[PDB]
PDB file of C-alpha atoms and ligand atoms in Angstrom:
ATOM      1  CA  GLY A  23      -0.042   0.108   0.015  1.00 10.62           C
ATOM      2  CA  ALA A  24       1.058   3.910  -0.288  1.00  9.85           C
ATOM      3  CA  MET A  25       3.002   5.237   2.676  1.00 12.70           C
ATOM      4  CA  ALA A  26       0.419   7.867   3.540  1.00 17.92           C
ATOM      5  CA  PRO A  27      -2.804   6.836   1.206  1.00 19.24           C
ATOM      6  CA  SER A  28      -3.894  10.247  -0.365  1.00 19.81           C
ATOM      7  CA  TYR A  29      -6.735  11.436  -2.710  1.00 19.51           C
ATOM      8  CA  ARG A  30      -5.866  13.700  -5.613  1.00 18.71           C
ATOM      9  CA  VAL A  31      -7.480  15.267  -8.940  1.00 17.57           C
ATOM     10  CA  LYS A  32      -5.938  16.121 -12.088  1.00 18.06           C
ATOM     11  CA  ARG A  33      -7.366  17.671 -15.157  1.00 18.22           C
ATOM     12  CA  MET A  34      -5.943  15.453 -17.983  1.00 17.88           C
ATOM     13  CA  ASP A  35      -6.433  12.306 -20.077  1.00 13.81           C
ATOM     14  CA  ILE A  36      -6.875   9.171 -17.728  1.00 10.44           C
ATOM     15  CA  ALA A  37      -5.063   7.333 -20.876  1.00  8.28           C
ATOM     16  CA  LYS A  38      -1.758   9.290 -19.505  1.00  6.85           C
ATOM     17  CA  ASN A  39      -2.014   8.512 -15.840  1.00  7.37           C
ATOM     18  CA  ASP A  40       0.949   8.167 -13.602  1.00  5.02           C
ATOM     19  CA  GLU A  41      -0.466   5.360 -11.526  1.00  6.33           C
ATOM     20  CA  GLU A  42      -0.055   1.344 -11.317  1.00  5.44           C
ATOM     21  CA  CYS A  43      -3.372   0.721 -12.699  1.00  5.49           C
ATOM     22  CA  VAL A  44      -6.543   2.201 -14.422  1.00  5.30           C
ATOM     23  CA  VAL A  45     -10.376   2.123 -13.943  1.00  2.00           C
ATOM     24  CA  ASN A  46     -12.216   2.517 -17.385  1.00  2.50           C
ATOM     25  CA  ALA A  47     -15.713   3.817 -17.405  1.00  3.45           C
ATOM     26  CA  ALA A  48     -16.782   0.821 -19.481  1.00  2.44           C
ATOM     27  CA  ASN A  49     -19.821  -0.403 -20.977  1.00  2.00           C
ATOM     28  CA  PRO A  50     -21.504  -3.714 -20.244  1.00  3.00           C
ATOM     29  CA  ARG A  51     -20.401  -5.221 -23.655  1.00  2.00           C
ATOM     30  CA  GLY A  52     -16.839  -4.536 -23.820  1.00  2.00           C
ATOM     31  CA  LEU A  53     -17.308  -2.207 -26.810  1.00  2.00           C
ATOM     32  CA  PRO A  54     -14.870   0.705 -27.550  1.00  2.00           C
ATOM     33  CA  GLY A  55     -17.307   3.150 -26.688  1.00  2.00           C
ATOM     34  CA  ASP A  56     -16.830   7.177 -26.224  1.00  2.00           C
ATOM     35  CA  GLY A  57     -15.148   9.488 -23.869  1.00  2.00           C
ATOM     36  CA  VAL A  58     -13.018   7.783 -21.160  1.00  2.00           C
ATOM     37  CA  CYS A  59     -13.846   4.118 -22.700  1.00  2.00           C
ATOM     38  CA  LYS A  60     -12.327   5.028 -26.305  1.00  2.00           C
ATOM     39  CA  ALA A  61      -9.193   6.655 -24.677  1.00  2.00           C
ATOM     40  CA  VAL A  62      -8.833   3.341 -22.725  1.00  2.00           C
ATOM     41  CA  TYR A  63      -9.384   1.498 -26.095  1.00  2.00           C
ATOM     42  CA  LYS A  64      -6.827   3.443 -28.025  1.00  2.00           C
ATOM     43  CA  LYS A  65      -4.261   2.964 -25.131  1.00  4.83           C
ATOM     44  CA  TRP A  66      -4.899  -0.537 -23.945  1.00  3.72           C
ATOM     45  CA  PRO A  67      -6.912  -2.389 -26.839  1.00  3.26           C
ATOM     46  CA  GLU A  68      -5.761  -5.855 -25.352  1.00  6.50           C
ATOM     47  CA  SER A  69      -7.537  -5.281 -22.195  1.00  7.12           C
ATOM     48  CA  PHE A  70     -10.897  -5.568 -23.965  1.00  9.45           C
ATOM     49  CA  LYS A  71     -10.536  -9.344 -24.603  1.00 11.47           C
ATOM     50  CA  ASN A  72     -13.504 -10.760 -22.664  1.00 13.62           C
ATOM     51  CA  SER A  73     -14.050  -7.506 -20.860  1.00 10.84           C
ATOM     52  CA  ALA A  74     -17.826  -7.556 -20.901  1.00  9.95           C
ATOM     53  CA  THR A  75     -19.570  -7.658 -17.509  1.00  7.97           C
ATOM     54  CA  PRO A  76     -22.780  -6.510 -16.018  1.00  8.97           C
ATOM     55  CA  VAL A  77     -23.898  -3.077 -14.600  1.00 10.57           C
ATOM     56  CA  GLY A  78     -22.758  -2.640 -11.110  1.00 11.86           C
ATOM     57  CA  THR A  79     -19.450  -5.030 -11.460  1.00 10.67           C
ATOM     58  CA  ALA A  80     -15.814  -4.224 -12.502  1.00 10.79           C
ATOM     59  CA  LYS A  81     -13.863  -6.823 -14.296  1.00 13.39           C
ATOM     60  CA  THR A  82     -10.028  -6.735 -14.455  1.00 14.66           C
ATOM     61  CA  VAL A  83      -8.040  -7.429 -17.525  1.00 15.96           C
ATOM     62  CA  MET A  84      -4.156  -7.175 -18.053  1.00 18.07           C
ATOM     63  CA  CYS A  85      -2.550  -5.037 -20.785  1.00 19.58           C
ATOM     64  CA  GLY A  86       0.894  -6.982 -20.643  1.00 19.94           C
ATOM     65  CA  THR A  87       1.386  -6.338 -16.909  1.00 19.14           C
ATOM     66  CA  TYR A  88      -0.763  -3.076 -16.725  1.00 17.35           C
ATOM     67  CA  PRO A  89      -4.244  -3.795 -14.853  1.00 13.17           C
ATOM     68  CA  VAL A  90      -7.206  -2.429 -16.603  1.00 18.07           C
ATOM     69  CA  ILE A  91     -10.407  -2.625 -14.419  1.00 19.45           C
ATOM     70  CA  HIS A  92     -13.505  -2.219 -16.422  1.00 19.97           C
ATOM     71  CA  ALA A  93     -16.112  -0.715 -13.899  1.00 19.25           C
ATOM     72  CA  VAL A  94     -19.507  -0.591 -15.454  1.00 21.93           C
ATOM     73  CA  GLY A  95     -21.796   2.326 -13.997  1.00 21.57           C
ATOM     74  CA  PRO A  96     -25.689   2.741 -15.004  1.00 19.33           C
ATOM     75  CA  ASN A  97     -26.850   4.632 -17.674  1.00 18.46           C
ATOM     76  CA  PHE A  98     -29.350   7.076 -15.853  1.00 16.88           C
ATOM     77  CA  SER A  99     -31.308   7.150 -19.048  1.00 18.59           C
ATOM     78  CA  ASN A 100     -32.394   3.582 -18.454  1.00 16.78           C
ATOM     79  CA  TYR A 101     -32.327   3.443 -14.840  1.00 10.56           C
ATOM     80  CA  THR A 102     -34.771   5.085 -12.119  1.00 12.39           C
ATOM     81  CA  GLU A 103     -32.725   7.512  -9.893  1.00 13.16           C
ATOM     82  CA  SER A 104     -33.045   4.737  -6.898  1.00 11.25           C
ATOM     83  CA  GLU A 105     -32.074   1.660  -8.898  1.00 12.24           C
ATOM     84  CA  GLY A 106     -29.154   3.881 -10.575  1.00 15.93           C
ATOM     85  CA  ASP A 107     -28.021   5.174  -7.229  1.00 13.90           C
ATOM     86  CA  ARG A 108     -27.815   1.537  -6.029  1.00 11.16           C
ATOM     87  CA  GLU A 109     -25.623   0.156  -9.169  1.00  8.01           C
ATOM     88  CA  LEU A 110     -23.360   3.367  -9.159  1.00 12.23           C
ATOM     89  CA  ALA A 111     -22.580   2.581  -5.523  1.00 11.66           C
ATOM     90  CA  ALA A 112     -21.953  -1.241  -6.126  1.00 10.72           C
ATOM     91  CA  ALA A 113     -19.751  -0.369  -9.441  1.00 12.48           C
ATOM     92  CA  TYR A 114     -17.419   1.467  -7.162  1.00 13.33           C
ATOM     93  CA  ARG A 115     -17.345  -1.338  -4.213  1.00 13.84           C
ATOM     94  CA  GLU A 116     -16.201  -3.944  -6.787  1.00 15.53           C
ATOM     95  CA  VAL A 117     -13.333  -1.452  -8.024  1.00 11.73           C
ATOM     96  CA  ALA A 118     -12.294  -1.228  -4.199  1.00 13.87           C
ATOM     97  CA  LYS A 119     -12.005  -5.041  -4.192  1.00 12.37           C
ATOM     98  CA  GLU A 120     -10.240  -5.275  -7.518  1.00 10.86           C
ATOM     99  CA  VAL A 121      -7.629  -2.578  -6.426  1.00 12.19           C
ATOM    100  CA  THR A 122      -7.367  -4.534  -3.184  1.00 11.58           C
ATOM    101  CA  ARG A 123      -6.643  -7.991  -4.763  1.00 10.53           C
ATOM    102  CA  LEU A 124      -4.246  -6.613  -7.252  1.00 10.34           C
ATOM    103  CA  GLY A 125      -1.877  -5.494  -4.510  1.00  9.08           C
ATOM    104  CA  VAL A 126      -1.260  -1.994  -6.353  1.00  5.74           C
ATOM    105  CA  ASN A 127       0.018   1.198  -4.517  1.00  4.88           C
ATOM    106  CA  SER A 128      -1.946   3.751  -6.643  1.00  4.65           C
ATOM    107  CA  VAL A 129      -5.050   3.715  -9.252  1.00  4.91           C
ATOM    108  CA  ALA A 130      -6.240   6.365 -11.859  1.00  7.42           C
ATOM    109  CA  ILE A 131     -10.028   6.652 -11.667  1.00  6.02           C
ATOM    110  CA  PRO A 132     -12.838   8.561 -13.497  1.00  8.26           C
ATOM    111  CA  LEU A 133     -16.125   9.546 -11.960  1.00  9.92           C
ATOM    112  CA  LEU A 134     -18.599   6.847 -13.215  1.00 12.19           C
ATOM    113  CA  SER A 135     -21.959   7.763 -14.777  1.00 14.21           C
ATOM    114  CA  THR A 136     -21.149  11.711 -15.089  1.00 15.20           C
ATOM    115  CA  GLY A 137     -20.867  11.691 -19.032  1.00 14.48           C
ATOM    116  CA  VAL A 138     -23.123  10.027 -21.547  1.00 15.90           C
ATOM    117  CA  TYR A 139     -24.550   7.949 -18.642  1.00 17.11           C
ATOM    118  CA  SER A 140     -25.549  10.739 -16.571  1.00 13.80           C
ATOM    119  CA  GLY A 141     -29.054  10.948 -18.055  1.00 15.77           C
ATOM    120  CA  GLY A 142     -28.294  14.953 -18.693  1.00 17.64           C
ATOM    121  CA  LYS A 143     -27.978  15.831 -15.108  1.00 18.53           C
ATOM    122  CA  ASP A 144     -24.739  16.762 -13.028  1.00 15.86           C
ATOM    123  CA  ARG A 145     -23.653  13.888 -10.889  1.00 17.51           C
ATOM    124  CA  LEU A 146     -20.496  14.979  -9.793  1.00 15.96           C
ATOM    125  CA  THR A 147     -20.978  15.135  -5.923  1.00 16.45           C
ATOM    126  CA  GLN A 148     -23.205  11.773  -6.243  1.00 16.58           C
ATOM    127  CA  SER A 149     -20.415   9.933  -7.940  1.00 16.72           C
ATOM    128  CA  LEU A 150     -17.616  11.347  -5.976  1.00 21.05           C
ATOM    129  CA  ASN A 151     -19.429  10.540  -2.745  1.00 20.98           C
ATOM    130  CA  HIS A 152     -19.816   6.739  -3.906  1.00 21.65           C
ATOM    131  CA  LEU A 153     -16.044   6.598  -5.079  1.00 22.00           C
ATOM    132  CA  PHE A 154     -15.080   7.833  -1.324  1.00 21.96           C
ATOM    133  CA  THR A 155     -17.358   5.254   0.404  1.00 20.92           C
ATOM    134  CA  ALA A 156     -15.841   2.422  -1.492  1.00 25.88           C
ATOM    135  CA  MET A 157     -12.182   3.705  -1.604  1.00 23.40           C
ATOM    136  CA  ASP A 158     -11.809   5.219   1.817  1.00 22.97           C
ATOM    137  CA  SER A 159     -11.055   1.692   3.309  1.00 21.56           C
ATOM    138  CA  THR A 160      -8.483   1.054   0.649  1.00 20.29           C
ATOM    139  CA  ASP A 161      -4.569   2.263   1.223  1.00 20.96           C
ATOM    140  CA  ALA A 162      -3.904   2.722  -2.392  1.00 21.68           C
ATOM    141  CA  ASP A 163      -3.064   6.548  -3.473  1.00 22.01           C
ATOM    142  CA  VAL A 164      -6.453   7.526  -5.646  1.00 22.86           C
ATOM    143  CA  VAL A 165      -5.904   9.981  -8.471  1.00 26.81           C
ATOM    144  CA  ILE A 166      -9.273  11.422  -9.915  1.00 23.92           C
ATOM    145  CA  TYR A 167      -8.839  12.101 -13.915  1.00 20.75           C
ATOM    146  CA  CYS A 168     -11.599  14.747 -15.065  1.00 22.77           C
ATOM    147  CA  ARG A 169     -11.988  17.063 -18.166  1.00 26.42           C
ATOM    148  CA  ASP A 170     -13.367  20.063 -17.033  1.00 27.25           C
ATOM    149  CA  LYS A 171     -11.516  22.990 -15.097  1.00 28.89           C
ATOM    150  CA  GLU A 172     -14.828  23.879 -12.971  1.00 26.17           C
ATOM    151  CA  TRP A 173     -15.045  20.139 -12.052  1.00 27.57           C
ATOM    152  CA  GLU A 174     -11.129  19.869 -11.074  1.00 29.48           C
ATOM    153  CA  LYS A 175     -11.880  23.032  -8.387  1.00 26.52           C
ATOM    154  CA  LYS A 176     -15.129  21.256  -7.166  1.00 23.45           C
ATOM    155  CA  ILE A 177     -13.463  17.799  -6.621  1.00 27.33           C
ATOM    156  CA  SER A 178     -10.167  19.607  -5.033  1.00 25.65           C
ATOM    157  CA  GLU A 179     -12.592  21.405  -2.604  1.00 23.80           C
ATOM    158  CA  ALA A 180     -14.458  18.029  -1.769  1.00 20.80           C
ATOM    159  CA  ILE A 181     -11.086  16.423  -1.149  1.00 19.54           C
ATOM    160  CA  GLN A 182      -9.506  19.440   0.956  1.00 17.21           C
ATOM    161  CA  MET A 183     -12.764  19.388   3.197  1.00 19.95           C
ATOM    162  CA  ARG A 184     -12.005  16.024   4.598  1.00 17.23           C
ATOM    163  CA  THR A 185      -8.133  16.969   5.294  1.00 18.81           C
TER     164      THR A 185
HETATM  165  C1  GVH B 208      -8.412  14.916 -23.287  1.00 15.76           C
HETATM  166  C2  GVH B 208      -8.959  14.152 -21.870  1.00 15.76           C
HETATM  167  N1  GVH B 208      -9.247  14.692 -20.705  1.00 15.76           N
HETATM  168  C3  GVH B 208      -8.422  16.235 -20.868  1.00 15.76           C
HETATM  169  N2  GVH B 208      -8.495  17.066 -19.883  1.00 15.76           N
HETATM  170  C4  GVH B 208      -7.532  18.050 -20.552  1.00 15.76           C
HETATM  171  C5  GVH B 208      -7.610  17.885 -21.738  1.00 15.76           C
HETATM  172  C6  GVH B 208      -7.970  16.727 -22.015  1.00 15.76           C
HETATM  173  C7  GVH B 208      -7.925  15.978 -23.224  1.00 15.76           C
HETATM  174  C1  GVH B 209     -11.887  12.323 -18.307  1.00 17.89           C
HETATM  175  C2  GVH B 209     -10.685  11.756 -18.194  1.00 17.89           C
HETATM  176  N1  GVH B 209     -10.134  11.289 -19.282  1.00 17.89           N
HETATM  177  C3  GVH B 209     -10.453  11.353 -20.441  1.00 17.89           C
HETATM  178  N2  GVH B 209     -10.032  10.691 -21.520  1.00 17.89           N
HETATM  179  C4  GVH B 209     -11.159  10.910 -22.563  1.00 17.89           C
HETATM  180  C5  GVH B 209     -12.171  11.487 -22.129  1.00 17.89           C
HETATM  181  C6  GVH B 209     -11.936  11.837 -20.650  1.00 17.89           C
HETATM  182  C7  GVH B 209     -12.453  12.379 -19.710  1.00 17.89           C
HETATM  183 CL1   CL B 210      -4.130  15.635 -21.313  1.00 18.08          CL
HETATM  184 CL1   CL B 211     -20.368   8.028 -18.359  1.00 14.23          CL
HETATM  185 CL1   CL B 212     -14.940  14.416 -16.376  1.00 12.03          CL
END
């Protein structure tokens, strides 16, 4: 584990992360997809062999010795707010299990269900709080990757508030 486990946020492509493993914002079918998923497909295409897995689960596939944890958040265009919220919490708990099993000291993670799966709503706080609930009991250094400068400021503030 990390010497002093931390949360950090960076505004850059998760495909260029400096961590020992990556979480993909996957689709259930292991398809190349869009956004984070397409960047992951371009960087680690070997990791999409038998990566298909249901909503609310995570499945790890190695690209060489580099682990890609395919985490399937709910599409809020299909789920109720209540059922979506349950599956989103579950996907992050499955990520925590995988990160623990792999024995990594660090992990790069996007905010699940906040892009094209958001059902047109701002889910920064919802997704981030489920991330914390899952990862708080792990000792890996967590680095959150986002696109938007306003999201970087809000994620940074939320991390600092707990410190
Ligand atoms: C691709 C993905 N995420 C990004 N954040 C800042 C620039 C950039 C490009
Ligand atoms: C957030 C972080 N990294 C990304 N790569 C491609 C899109 C995206 C969004
Ligand atoms: Cl970048
Ligand atoms: Cl998404
Ligand atoms: Cl983002």
